[PDB]
Amino acid sequence: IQAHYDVSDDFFALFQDPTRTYSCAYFEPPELTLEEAQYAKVDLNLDKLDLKPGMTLLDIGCGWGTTMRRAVERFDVNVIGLTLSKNQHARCEQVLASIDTNRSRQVLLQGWEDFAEPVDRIVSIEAFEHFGHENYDDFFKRCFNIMPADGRMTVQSSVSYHPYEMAARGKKLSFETARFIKFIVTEIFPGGRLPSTEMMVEHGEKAGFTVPEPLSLRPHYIKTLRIWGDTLQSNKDKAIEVTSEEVYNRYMKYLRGCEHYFTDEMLDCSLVTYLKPGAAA
Ligand SMILES: Nc1ncnc2c1ncn2[C@@H]1O[C@H](CSCC[C@H](N)C(=O)O)[C@@H](O)[C@H]1O
DSSP, X not given: OGGGGOOOHHHHXXXXXXXXXXXXOOOSSTTOOHHHHHHHHHHHHHGGGOOOTTOEEEEEXXXXXXXXXXXXXXXXXXXXXXXSOHHHXXXXXXXXXXXXXXXXXXXXXXXXXXXXXXXXXXXXXXXXXXXXXXXXXXXXXXXXXXXXXXXXXXEEEEEBOOHHXXXXXXXXXXXXXXXXXXXXXXXXXXXXXXXXXXXXXXHHHHHTOBOOOOEEOHHHHHHHXXXXXXXXXXXXXXXXXXXXXXXXXXXXXXXXXXXXXXXXXXXXXXXXXXXXXXXXX
């Protein structure tokens, strides 16, 4: 009965930009539209990956396929995307099928747990918080093992802090943040779990990866969540029509709540890079 909290693609179209990106944008230049800023976040990730023409890139949690398209277009690489959504899958094939390229392009309806084919490079933008702590060793091991000697991966993920770190900020705020996080992980992304940055880093390291200092995206998620919130708000009535007032207020609280806790430095978002020992310098 986890599917009570399932919301239709229609609803998400009433807050997200045209690319249907459901992750932190990168406003650099700061004057970028959200849509521009989502392309910019995609580039930010891919440009870390030492992609060369004819490599195969893996997108773990590929959504609507925008990352994969931009990759094949910009880097002339083959792509493979993993998604758990039947709709995302059909969309992705259509998106990929339209590209003017001899490059191989492929999208699978399944998790990384079931993927074990050799790829050169890996991107994963905000799928990670769906995985669960219990699965982290197996994730970084799978990723290390499917890549060549020079492999690289980025993982972008919202992040919380260890209950120890949060107490330093005061108990009132620490229990309040804990409850909000439970909310996210229950009603927004059922079964989810926010890692901390330190977990992202150390699991990567235990698997054999070199991990430079993660990049914080916090102010960008502030701006993203502002625009997401404002957009849903301005579409209040269509939103309710497509779902319920329940669903609507649920998402307004998510967007405004995250924006608030990010502003309060109670949440973060890290773009972590994992480099195999043979990665290019
Ligand atoms: N175990 C898993 N393996 C592969 N994808 C997973 C997964 N668990 C969740 N996901 C996927 O992760 C994606 C997170 S939403 C973000 C999608 C896209 N990268 C973007 O930035 O917009 C969804 O496609 C969801 O189905």
